Every structure is written in structure tokens, then in C-alpha cells.
Design a protein around this ligand. Structure first.
Ligand SMILES: *[C@@H]1O[C@H](CO)[C@@H](O[C@@H]2O[C@H](CO)[C@@H](O[C@@H]3O[C@H](CO)[C@@H](O)[C@H](O)[C@@H]3O)[C@H](O)[C@H]2NC(C)=O)[C@H](O)[C@H]1NC(C)=O
Ligand SMILES: *[C@@H]1O[C@H](CO)[C@@H](O[C@@H]2O[C@H](CO)[C@@H](O)[C@H](O)[C@H]2NC(C)=O)[C@H](O)[C@H]1NC(C)=O
Ligand SMILES: *[C@@H]1O[C@H](CO)[C@@H](O[C@@H]2O[C@H](CO)[C@@H](O)[C@H](O)[C@H]2NC(C)=O)[C@H](O)[C@H]1NC(C)=O
Ligand SMILES: *[C@@H]1O[C@H](CO)[C@@H](O[C@@H]2O[C@H](CO)[C@@H](O)[C@H](O)[C@H]2NC(C)=O)[C@H](O)[C@H]1NC(C)=O
Ligand code: NAG
Ligand code: NAG
Lengths: 49, 115, 49, 49
């Protein structure tokens, strides 16, 4: 069956980092990413008498 | 700033390290395509701030010191590429008695085997 | 982590080692911090207090 | 630009050479703490090109 439910929103998932005074992490291989962005520039020219 | 050059401002021309950007036109607007760079496939290493040779302290010129359990290397910060420590990628300043965490190793000099 | 968690996965690094990275970004060599660590820490604590 | 990275723009994240920045929340607003670097105790020298 289906229904409508109400709850309290969550913010994310815990990602506790392993911190010490002697350890470092270095990446080894890479990816290329392409994203998009949209921006309005103008509107319509109207005139009223 | 994004199309006619390369930007250093964070999160301005996309999310990541900026490489390029391309424009396109839309009715009453513009569209930008941002091309960036993302790291991946991290690993684990042990680090030290300096290396104490005989009475001298050596600091890395452009990279960082790492270890794989038994041997020490110097690598660049954004990509894993280990190289043998020499006198051409380190510089000397002082003696190994003031730095906290200085370790022992040897530094290879690329002149003695020549003569 | 530092500034690595804003452009991808988070990578850990000791704080005194990151302070040298940030010292290199303004034109001062990184051997200045390692030989004045206690004084810099005391100044930071006094200033934030 | 100040919290997730290190800035080179002059007088953007505080007065001096930018090192770090920390956020705090306030009723209907935000507060930034900027940590910078200031030189002192100058001297005198003779220079040549
Ligand atoms: C860095 O990441 C890239 C991808 O982002 C890795 O390239 C990928 O490597 C795998 C393993 O060699 C390739 O899989 C291959 O697929 C063929 C079928 O097409 C299969 O027959 C092979 O046995 C193998 O599984 C994959 O195609 C390749 N991706 C691309 C786009 O070429 C790369 O290996 C990573 N670097 C390191 C050092 O792992
Ligand atoms: C850490 O890296 C070093 C790289 O020198 C490894 O030592 C080499 O291992 C290969 C493969 O067994 C040998 O052919 C070389 O002779 C070794 N080098 C020397 C100088 O003897 C070492 O095995 C690595 N350690 C771990 C735990 O992976
Ligand atoms: C990393 O942290 C550990 C734990 O605080 C430090 O280990 C101690 O170092 C002191 C010397 O400063 C020794 O007297 C202790 O016996 C060590 N504790 C151990 C081995 O359990 C370590 O020095 C720190 N590393 C750095 C570079 O500061
Ligand atoms: C690095 O090597 C040096 C010399 O091989 C060590 O310095 C000696 O340390 C021992 C005990 O730590 C002292 O009894 C000697 O007097 C020291 N020698 C000199 C010439 O001062 C040093 O301890 C080594 N590094 C570490 C972390 O143990
Ligand atoms: C990296 O840290 C230690 C050192 O190798 C290792 O035991 C651990 O499993 C690795 N991963 C994490 C998340 O700490
Ligand atoms: C620095 O300039 C000269 C050169 O040493 C010296 O006589 C003078 O007192 C110093 N201070 C100032 C403010 O000029």
C-alpha cells in the first residue's frame, strides 16, 4: 500500500576522517569533469501609450 | 575570467580545479560549460617534516616526504610519483636539533660516483 | 583535511604540515615555521583568546 | 574563497597576508574570523641590482 508520511529532514552521512600526526593521503589517478551553468541576460522591450 | 583565461578563485568557474570553459547562446541567456580536474584513488603513507643527515637538516624543495614501510621517497603533492632523495631536490637549513619529528635517512650525492 | 575537501575527496594531513603549505603561499619559506613553532602557537592562542 | 581556500585578493579576507578563516553563526547572520600575517621590526641595508 501507499501513503503520505512526515518526518524530520537529515543533512548527510557521517564521514569521520582518520587523523593522526604521522599519516598523509595522496591521490593516484584522475578524472575529467564537465558541468553547465545557465544565466539570463535580458528581457522583452515593451511600450504602452 | 573563465573563458579568456584560467581562474584561481574557488568555486567560481565550476567545482574542482579549473581547466577550460566554453560558451553557448540561448534565448535571452547564456550557457557555460566548465571543464575541470578531479583526483581519485587515494592511498596511505607515513610522513616526516625533515631528514637529518650528518649534522644537517634537509627540507624538500617542491614536494613532500613519504614512506612505504621501509624506504623513503619524495613526491609531488597532487600526484603519486616517488623519486630517490638527492641533493638536487632538497635544501639545507640548520641542524637536526630544533625540529620536532625529524627522522634519520641518507641523502645521495650525484657527484662522487662520477669521480 | 585543509582545502582538499572542497574540490573532491577529503585527504588528511597533519596541521603543522598544512601551516607550512599556507606559509609557502605568501612568499615565506617553510623552514621558518618549523623553527618557530611554539612561538607561533602561543601567538595564535593569545590572539584568539 | 576565504574558508574553502586561500585568497590572493587584497583586503578581501582581512587586512594583511591571508592565512586562514573560520565561520560562526549568529541570529540572521554570519561571522567570519580571519587569521593573517603581519611583518615587524624592520632594519636598514644597502642594495645593488
Ligand atoms: C584511472 O582511471 C581510468 C578511468 O577513469 C582507468 O582507465 C580504465 O582502466 C580499466 C582497467 O584497465 C579499463 O577497463 C578495461 O575494460 C576492457 C573492456 O573495454 C576490458 O577488456 C579490460 O580487461 C579492462 O577491464 C577501462 O577501460 C579504462 N577506462 C578508460 C576510459 O580507458 C585507469 O586505469 C586509471 N588508472 C589506473 C592507474 O588505474
Ligand atoms: C617499498 O619500496 C621499495 C622500493 O625500493 C621496495 O624495495 C624493492 O622491492 C623490489 C621488489 O621486491 C626489489 O626488486 C628491490 O630490490 C627493492 N629495493 C631495494 C633497495 O632492495 C620495497 O619492497 C617496498 N616495500 C613494501 C612493503 O612494499
Ligand atoms: C605523534 O604523536 C605521538 C603520540 O603523542 C608522539 O609519540 C610520543 O613522542 C614522544 C617524543 O616527543 C615520546 O617521548 C613518546 O614516548 C611518544 N609516545 C609513544 C611512542 O607512544 C609522536 O612523537 C608524535 N609525532 C610527532 C612528529 O610529533
Ligand atoms: C639519528 O642518528 C643519530 C646518530 O646516529 C642519533 O643521535 C645519537 O642519539 C643517541 C641516542 O638517541 C645518543 O646517545 C648519541 O649521543 C647521539 N649522537 C650524536 C652524535 O649526537 C639519533 O638518536 C638518531 N635519531 C633517532 C630518532 O634516534
Ligand atoms: C590508512 O591508515 C592506516 C595505515 O595504513 C591503515 O591501518 C588504515 O586501514 C588505512 N585507512 C584508513 C581509513 O585509515
Ligand atoms: C635608516 O637609514 C639610514 C641608513 O642606515 C640611517 O641613518 C637612518 O637612521 C635609518 N632610519 C631612517 C628612518 O632613515
Amino acid at each position: 500500500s501507499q501513503s503520505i508520511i512526515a518526518y524530520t529532514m537529515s543533512l548527510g552521512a557521517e564521514n569521520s576522517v582518520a587523523y593522526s600526526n604521522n599519516s598523509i593521503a595522496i591521490p593516484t589517478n584522475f578524472t575529467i569533469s564537465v558541468t553547465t551553468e545557465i544565466l539570463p541576460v535580458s528581457m522583452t522591450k515593451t511600450s504602452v501609450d | 575570467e573563465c573563458v579568456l583565461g584560467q581562474s584561481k578563485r574557488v568555486d567560481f568557474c565550476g567545482k574542482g580545479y579549473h581547466l577550460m570553459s566554453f560558451p553557448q547562446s540561448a534565448p535571452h541567456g547564456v550557457v557555460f560549460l566548465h571543464v575541470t580536474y578531479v583526483p581519485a584513488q587515494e592511498k596511505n603513507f607515513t610522513t616526516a617534516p625533515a631528514i637529518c643527515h650528518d649534522g644537517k637538516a634537509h627540507f624538500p624543495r617542491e614536494g613532500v616526504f613519504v614512506s612505504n614501510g621501509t624506504h623513503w621517497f619524495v613526491t609531488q603533492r597532487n600526484f603519486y610519483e616517488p623519486q630517490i632523495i638527492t641533493t638536487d631536490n632538497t635544501f639545507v637549513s640548520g641542524n637536526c636539533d630544533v625540529v620536532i619529528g625529524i627522522v634519520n635517512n641518507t641523502v645521495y650525492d650525484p657527484l662522487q660516483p662520477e669521480l | 583535511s585543509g582545502w582538499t575537501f572542497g574540490a573532491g575527496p577529503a585527504l588528511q594531513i597533519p596541521f603543522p604540515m598544512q601551516m607550512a603549505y599556507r606559509f609557502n603561499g605568501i612568499g615565506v619559506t617553510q623552514n621558518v615555521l618549523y623553527e618557530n613553532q611554539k612561538l607561533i602557537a602561543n601567538q595564535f592562542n593569545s590572539a584568539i583568546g
